[PDB]
Design a protein around this ligand. Structure first.
Ligand SMILES: CCCCCCCCCCCCCCC(O)OC[C@@H](O)COP(=O)(O)OC[C@H](N)C(=O)O
Ligand SMILES: *[C@@H]1O[C@H](CO)[C@@H](O[C@@H]2O[C@H](CO)[C@@H](O)[C@H](O)[C@H]2NC(C)=O)[C@H](O)[C@H]1NC(C)=O
Ligand SMILES: *[C@@H]1O[C@H](CO)[C@@H](O)[C@H](O)[C@H]1NC(C)=O
Ligand SMILES: [Ca+2]
Ligand SMILES: [Ca+2]
Ligand SMILES: [Ca+2]
Ligand SMILES: [Ca+2]
Ligand SMILES: [Ca+2]
Ligand SMILES: [Ca+2]
Ligand SMILES: [Ca+2]
Ligand SMILES: [Cl-]
Ligand SMILES: [Cl-]
Ligand SMILES: [Cl-]
Length: 146
């Protein structure tokens, strides 16, 4: 947050400016050292608004081992779908040509074949499946706070 006066003379600090106070994308950018880091942080940050209080809740959401809300914040290592289908590598173009990837969604952390919810799918974190007949399916990930 920018209370207006001279705080902006200080070098950006993520803890002070974004975690101890709400911040704008530009503030986050100033506090971080790259666009990559900014895209990643901003995606995790916005996906955790429903959990900014208390800090323990916010930190858990940002860590992303559990899904908050619809799970756009999820960054865990589950790579199998609900029905048990092994997830397809996000970077692979087979058996399904991904409409969603690193380019269309930077900061979504679409690594390997881990489940993610880059488009805010209502059924939670998902992944393109290795089954030729099923393009994508949601995964079973633990919900934050339960
Ligand atoms: C330099 C003073 C300018 C303000 C003139 C108003 C009258 C005097 C009252 C003083 C209170 C307001 C101080 C505001 C100001 O300029 O902030 C100085 C900054 O350098 C401090 O920055 P920083 O610690 O990052 O921001 C404040 C915020 N509570 C935080 O934790 O981020
Ligand atoms: C979750 O998955 C990540 C990503 O594969 C694992 O971290 C990687 O671990 C390898 C060693 O096995 C390192 O070479 C990589 O640098 C790590 N990837 C990065 C840069 O994040 C991590 O160990 C896994 N943890 C769990 C929960 O199993
Ligand atoms: C992302 O998708 C676009 C078109 O959908 C494609 O041009 C690009 O090569 C893809 N890259 C990834 C993230 O695999
Ligand atoms: Ca501030
Ligand atoms: Ca600021
Ligand atoms: Ca700043
Ligand atoms: Ca602090
Ligand atoms: Ca403050
Ligand atoms: Ca600024
Ligand atoms: Ca700036
Ligand atoms: Cl396809
Ligand atoms: Cl990868
Ligand atoms: Cl899905």
């Amino acid at each position: 947050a920018n209370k207006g006066f001279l705080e902006e003379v200080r070098k950006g600090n993520l803890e002070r400016e974004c975690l101890e106070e709400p911040c704008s994308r530009e503030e986050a950018f100033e506090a971080l050292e790259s666009l990559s880091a900014t895209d990643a942080f901003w995606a995790k940050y916005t996906a955790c608004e429903s959990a900014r209080n208390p800090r323990e809740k916010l930190n858990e959401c940002l860590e992303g081992n559990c899904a908050e809300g619809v799970g756009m914040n999820y960054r865990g290592n589950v790579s199998v779908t609900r029905s048990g289908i092994e997830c397809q590598l996000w970077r692979s173009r087979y058996p399904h040509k991904p409409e969603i990837n690193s380019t269309t969604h930077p900061g979504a952390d679409l690594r390997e074949n881990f489940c993610r919810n880059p488009d805010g799918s209502i059924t939670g974190p998902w992944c393109y499946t290795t089954s030729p007949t099923l393009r994508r399916e949601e995964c079973s990930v633990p919900v934050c706070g339960q």
